[PDB]
Amino acid sequence: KTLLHKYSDIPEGTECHRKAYASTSIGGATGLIVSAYSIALKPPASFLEGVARTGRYTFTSAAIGAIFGLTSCISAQVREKPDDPLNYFIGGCAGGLTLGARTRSYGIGAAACAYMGLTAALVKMGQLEGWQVFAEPKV
Amino acid sequence: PFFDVQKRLGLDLDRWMTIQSAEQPHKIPGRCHAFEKEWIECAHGIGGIRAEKECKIEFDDFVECLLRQKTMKRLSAIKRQRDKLIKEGKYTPPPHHLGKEDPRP
Amino acid sequence: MTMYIAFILSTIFVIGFVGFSSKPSPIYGGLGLIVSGGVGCGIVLNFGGSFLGLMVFLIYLGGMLVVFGYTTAMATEMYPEVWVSNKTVFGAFVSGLMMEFCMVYYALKEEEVEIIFKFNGLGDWVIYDTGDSGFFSEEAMGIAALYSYGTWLVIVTGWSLLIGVVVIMEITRGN
Amino acid sequence: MNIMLTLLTNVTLASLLVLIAFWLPQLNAYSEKTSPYECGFDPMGSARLPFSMKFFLVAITFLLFDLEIALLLPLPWASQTNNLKTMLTMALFLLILLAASLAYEWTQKGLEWA
Amino acid sequence: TMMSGRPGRVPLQFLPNEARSLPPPKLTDPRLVYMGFLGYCSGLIDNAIRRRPVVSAGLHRQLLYVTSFVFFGYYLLKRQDYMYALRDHDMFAYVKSHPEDFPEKDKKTYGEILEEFHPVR
Amino acid sequence: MNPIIYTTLIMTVMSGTMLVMISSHWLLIWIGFEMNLLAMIPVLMKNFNPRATEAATKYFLTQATASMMLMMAIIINLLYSGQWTITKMFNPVAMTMMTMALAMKLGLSPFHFWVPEVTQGISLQAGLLLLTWQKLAPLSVLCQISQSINPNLMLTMAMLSILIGGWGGLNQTQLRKIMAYSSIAHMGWMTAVLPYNTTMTILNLLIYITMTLAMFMLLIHSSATTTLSLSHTWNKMPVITSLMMVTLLSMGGLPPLSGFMPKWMIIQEMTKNESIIMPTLMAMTALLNLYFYMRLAYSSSLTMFPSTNNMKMKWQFEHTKQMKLLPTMIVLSTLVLPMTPALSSLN
Amino acid sequence: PGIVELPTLEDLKVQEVKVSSSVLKAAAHHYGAQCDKPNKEFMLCRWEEKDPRRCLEEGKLVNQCALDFFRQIKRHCAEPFTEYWTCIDYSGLQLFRHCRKQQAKFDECVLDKLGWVRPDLGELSKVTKVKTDRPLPENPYHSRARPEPNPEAEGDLKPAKHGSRLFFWTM
Amino acid sequence: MPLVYMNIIMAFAIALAGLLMYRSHLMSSLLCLEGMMLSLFIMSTLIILNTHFTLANMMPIILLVFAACEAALGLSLLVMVSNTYGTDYVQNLNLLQC
């Protein structure tokens, strides 16, 4: 949760380098978890193969996070509109393009751009409007 | 789905062992009988939501009796201070603590 | 050194667990389980639980006997593995011992270690109570209340054991 | 601590005896002397191959009965209660359930081997 | 949760004696009639599954189906009404006991209130 | 297995569940779970196959790990509170461990891997017992400890369960595995409302039990364990496949069938607590279950697959054994929506 | 929280009954018969108060009475009692059985010189009444005020205003 | 919490990790289950003895009884697996998939 607090604490549209670093850390953590699950469920033939798979997944996730944070913060700075979800959408589409590049497929890139950008815009909207993915029971 | 068959039929199938303050063989008291009794009496019929905050003092005392976390922390701090003073040479344990006097029967 | 018999025994317990958990051949894992059972008996006796500890030792001593026979029958291998016969078993053993040594030194040195809960390095003697039990063994009186207070537990456990005999017979029928 | 001292003393005596047995005597160890014993001829297979246990069911039932041995040991202190009626009823209940289990396994040809 | 811990609730009681104050469900209730319809459908499905004449076979069995469904439905409806009545009773009692949490609001006529007009152009 | 022994073992399973649902002491609840496992293991292997033994072994291992974790959680709560009563759990780590154990017993993802394998290995009747009765005790224990549960963990497990149960079923041509994945998805639905309203979980459990009983009894009546075997049923017993189509539609959640009410009320309760994204995602992901349900329906009833010549012999004979409760189960599973307000009885 | 009010060392100083366990056990029955009153008063104080500090004076009285009992024994029956407690000392369990003759000597001497009669079996275990001028503790546990109970059972049940009021259901 | 509680909970964690990380034999994982049961017995006994919960000094014995029941079940399954495959290796429990 400390990484999420790190990403949130940096003001939007400011300290773009720190925001990119936080996004990269989050992407790396997610990639590490995915790599652990992949190694367990689908066993790697060798320790070197497991390390290669972990590195590939982690680098892809970290690149996605870094591109998302860098592009979103830079767009927020240049447009100068901090709370606009379009910045998050641009960052998400850039992340999807990065995923397509890492997977060396155009179709993956385009589908990821659309879906990931929309999800990031929705996340920004949830920040602005106070949407709760997990709601404390209040009845 | 907790069908309280025990309460409906007046059968004490397992409630006898539920708490440490309940009746025990030869009236052997629990190590925290007083705190447990106080906490149970405080949180009786007021509901869990209320009892979680209106009897928090009782529950904290019960937990302290059970685990002795605060007492152990204080004892460790006192021992650390005593050891530091001994290292500094400004403290000397009393003869009775050192074993030079017969303890009271 | 006798001020911390409990800690030494608990460390031996954890080492036995790291032995049978690294999964050598079932024989040496049974050796580890026997050692850990003895050490646990020691700990419980140091805390005043002579009957309970002796009972654990007796029950696990018999249980590991059937395990040993079963191993020589089903879980058998031409070259049974010791904790130094495979890189995986030795890796697990070394990792377990190192993890213990790590937490052991950490808590002993640091006043208050907190791995997942908060642990105080003060010796176990501190927590002990100052009361007197008189002409009684509280463990014995409590364990004997299973027949006077725990009629329900006796019913459940007896039924469970009879049904366990039935269950073993059915599971081993083999059609 | 007395029990610990006694255990240490006995184990040290045994270990000293083992040391004296493996160091006082003279040794001429050669391959044929340390080979496995198979009544003069050489073994066919290993002694680490599976050895079928024809009494497996009895062993599992032995575990289940050692549980009852554990449950029945508190009886000497139980007889010191004031509710001797309930204590006696439950003790006889446990012993009759053990008898029932033995009878079931016996009648179902479970105590037999193979 | 909710009503499970209501004070005075006897465990494993379908209908408390307090419910008798409430009017009994009418035997012509639409809900009970629907329960009887479910019973009739059950009888028809049973006949179909056993390959009997669907609508004519086993009239006693269909009668038993309908009667059992209506019989259980009557008590189910009574319990449902009792539970909703308990909910309303507790809600009104809580509103009375906590006037501050449920304050009466000043009633302003539409003339006083200002609501912005958004032209549909 | 002698029928007397079988009756005794089934009664033992039910008695373990009853002990779980009747005991106020944690030790006795754990004892009930242990009795359930002991009785269940022989029941799963009533028909002796290597597959039955493999399924029994997997089930035993998973449930034993869950029970050990639950006992550790109980002991930790005792250490930090000194209370054996089933109530608020006073230590968060113990609560997390207990939630993990109870989810593993319920088969909630990421502890779902065993459910399809066990369901496929065992017979249809043992599958019915596994997927309807066994779910009761862990859900009861979760309902009693709902307040202590961290909503995030339960909701994450529920959403993962819905997603995985939907995804896996799409790839299945074996009826038992399909049922296992649908059970995973429906259990994810049930646990989603556990933090918010337990009565909704009870209602969903009842509707799901009715539908699963109807489906398993219909499969037993048709003696089908694969989609192709079910495909032939139209030639022999069309009514069975038609009722299966209706029950599948109810399982998908389509209005006006009774499967709709549990989703409806769960969405309502989640929305009352300001949960909007979670209900929307859960409802949308339920469409995959609908997809594989519809594929099964296409194979079974809506389209007439090719039969075999030897079925002509089967036409002459009639089904010997009658499942008495099947028609009422079908009727309840499909035609109970007009009676939702009655959800205050179990209340 | 607050400071613990431990009593001063001087107040807790008392004359001590410096006699071994065997000596006390040899005189145990006559001691309970003779010194019952103060011992019972101290026991009642301890159990009602639940504070060791509160009952210090009664404990001092207990110790004084025990000393007086042993002084009377020394004055009148010293040697037979010395032989008796010497006999008990040898047994590791300090059993009464092995020393019946010396106990008979001690009991006869005590009955003659001091008139004490040994309590019979099942007498010293009887719950006894104690008359005390010390007030009964009002709140021995020092409990806080109990939280006020929730309001309950307002009155009669009337049918729901418009039924279930669930979505579209009218009943 | 004293350090002995730390060691015993560490033993439970180690046994759980051992059981969840199989290698080849099933007997070893059943031994890890029994180790978990032993650790639970020790923890419960220590808690009940330190807190003088007299009527709870029987709970460890019931825990041991059901632990032995579980062990018997495990061995009775292992025997059938060995009979059907010739070894106790876990890799042979591969017929059921997904």
UniProtKB/Swiss-Prot annotation, chain C:
InterPro entries: ComplexI_Subunit6, NADH_UbQ/plastoQ_OxRdtase_su6, Nuo/plastoQ_OxRdtase_6_NuoJ. GO terms for biological process: mitochondrial electron transport, NADH to ubiquinone; mitochondrial respiratory chain complex I assembly. Keywords: Electron transport, Membrane, Mitochondrion, Mitochondrion inner membrane, NAD, Respiratory chain, Translocase, Transmembrane, Transmembrane helix, Transport, Ubiquinone. It is found in: Mitochondrion inner membrane. Coiled coil: none annotated. It is a multi-pass membrane protein. The chain crosses the membrane at residues 1-21, 25-45, 47-67, 88-108, 149-169. It catalyses: a ubiquinone + NADH + 5 H(+)(in) = a ubiquinol + NAD(+) + 4 H(+)(out). One of its GO terms (molecular function) is NADH dehydrogenase (ubiquinone) activity. GO terms for cellular component: mitochondrial inner membrane; mitochondrion; respiratory chain complex I. It comes from the Eukaryota. Its EC number is 7.1.1.2. Core subunit of respiratory chain NADH dehydrogenase (Complex I) which is composed of 45 different subunits. Core subunit of the mitochondrial membrane respiratory chain NADH dehydrogenase (Complex I) which catalyzes electron transfer from NADH through the respiratory chain, using ubiquinone as an electron acceptor. Essential for the catalytic activity and assembly of complex I. Belongs to the complex I subunit 6 family. This is NADH-ubiquinone oxidoreductase chain 6.
Curated annotation (Swiss-Prot), chain D:
Disulfide bonds: none annotated. GO terms for biological process: mitochondrial electron transport, NADH to ubiquinone. It is an enzyme of class 7 (translocase). It catalyses: a ubiquinone + NADH + 5 H(+)(in) = a ubiquinol + NAD(+) + 4 H(+)(out). Its EC number is 7.1.1.2. Its main location: mitochondrion. It is found in: Mitochondrion inner membrane. Pfam families: Oxidored_q4. Keywords: Electron transport, Membrane, Mitochondrion, Mitochondrion inner membrane, NAD, Respiratory chain, Translocase, Transmembrane, Transmembrane helix, Transport, Ubiquinone. It is a multi-pass membrane protein. It comes from the Eukaryota. GO terms for cellular component: mitochondrial inner membrane; respiratory chain complex I. GO terms for molecular function: NADH dehydrogenase (ubiquinone) activity. Core subunit of respiratory chain NADH dehydrogenase (Complex I) which is composed of 45 different subunits. Interacts with TMEM186. Interacts with TMEM242. Belongs to the complex I subunit 3 family. Core subunit of the mitochondrial membrane respiratory chain NADH dehydrogenase (Complex I) which catalyzes electron transfer from NADH through the respiratory chain, using ubiquinone as an electron acceptor. Essential for the catalytic activity of complex I. PANTHER family: NADH-UBIQUINONE OXIDOREDUCTASE CHAIN 3. This is NADH-ubiquinone oxidoreductase chain 3. It comes from Sus scrofa. The lineage of its organism: Eukaryota, Metazoa, Chordata, Craniata, Vertebrata.
From Swiss-Prot, chain F:
Its EC number is 7.1.1.2. GO terms for cellular component: mitochondrial inner membrane; respiratory chain complex I. It is found in: Mitochondrion inner membrane. Keywords: Electron transport, Membrane, Mitochondrion, Mitochondrion inner membrane, NAD, Respiratory chain, Translocase, Transmembrane, Transmembrane helix, Transport, Ubiquinone. One of its GO terms (molecular function) is NADH dehydrogenase (ubiquinone) activity. It comes from the Eukaryota. It comes from Sus scrofa (Pig). Belongs to the complex I subunit 2 family. Its main location: mitochondrion. Signal peptide: none annotated. This is NADH-ubiquinone oxidoreductase chain 2. One of its GO terms (biological process) is reactive oxygen species metabolic process.
Curated annotation (Swiss-Prot), chain H:
One of its GO terms (biological process) is ATP synthesis coupled electron transport. One of its GO terms (cellular component) is mitochondrial inner membrane. It is a multi-pass membrane protein. The chain crosses the membrane at residues 1-21, 29-49, 61-81. It is found in: Mitochondrion inner membrane. Keywords: Electron transport, Membrane, Mitochondrion, Mitochondrion inner membrane, NAD, Respiratory chain, Translocase, Transmembrane, Transmembrane helix, Transport, Ubiquinone. Its main location: mitochondrion. It catalyses: a ubiquinone + NADH + 5 H(+)(in) = a ubiquinol + NAD(+) + 4 H(+)(out). Its EC number is 7.1.1.2. One of its GO terms (molecular function) is NADH dehydrogenase (ubiquinone) activity. InterPro entries: NADH_UbQ_OxRdtase_chain4L/K (IPR001133), NUOK/Mnh_C1-like (IPR039428). Core subunit of respiratory chain NADH dehydrogenase (Complex I) which is composed of 45 different subunits. Core subunit of the mitochondrial membrane respiratory chain NADH dehydrogenase (Complex I) which catalyzes electron transfer from NADH through the respiratory chain, using ubiquinone as an electron acceptor. Part of the enzyme membrane arm which is embedded in the lipid bilayer and involved in proton translocation. Belongs to the complex I subunit 4L family. This is NADH-ubiquinone oxidoreductase chain 4L. The gene is MT-ND4L.
